[PDB]
């Protein structure tokens, strides 16, 4: 019920929506002409993409993000910020990283901007380096 944080925390992503809930995006989207819509149309129907269990859903979202961050302007905060989140669950971290960074830099406060790129500057550092399978098996010589 805030109305007021403009930036969602990660949590929400979290949060699926109904079969209806992402019907009625497409009706606002497809009744304005489809692709002729505004962006704000657009922009939620990336954010719904992204919400969904499958990863198909959020390669899509993040190809419709990128589109409205080259053609829109002033809404590359909230891009760079859902394109951290949509990239985070491709892994894609060196984008999320990059996007991030410069959000970041702004030098704004919010606390869930410090925290959101925590998970993406912690998973590229805590990753490793050559990237460890996760030794699965337990200490077999053993005398001392």
């Not at 929400?12 to 497409?26: H, K, S, T, V």
């Not at 719904?48 to 961050?69: A, F, M, P, Q, W």
Request: aromatic share 10%; with cysteine; hydrophobic share 35%.
């Amino acid at each position: 019920m805030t109305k007021v944080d403009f930036w969602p925390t990660l949590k929400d992503a979290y949060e699926p929506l109904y079969p209806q809930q992402l019907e009625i995006l497409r009706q606002q989207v497809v009744s304005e002409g489809g692709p002729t819509a505004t962006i704000q149309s657009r922009f939620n129907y990336a954010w719904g993409l992204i919400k969904s269990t499958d990863v198909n859903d959020e390669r899509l979202g993040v190809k419709i993000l990128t589109d409205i961050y080259k053609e829109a302007e002033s809404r590359r905060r909230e891009c760079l910020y859902y394109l951290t989140i949509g990239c985070y669950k491709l892994g894609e971290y060196s984008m999320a990283k990059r996007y991030v960074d410069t959000l970041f830099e702004h030098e704004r406060n919010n606390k869930q901007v410090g925290a959101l790129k925590s998970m993406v500057e912690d998973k590229i550092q805590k990753e490793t380096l050559k990237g460890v399978v996760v030794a699965g098996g337990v200490h077999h010589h053993h005398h001392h």
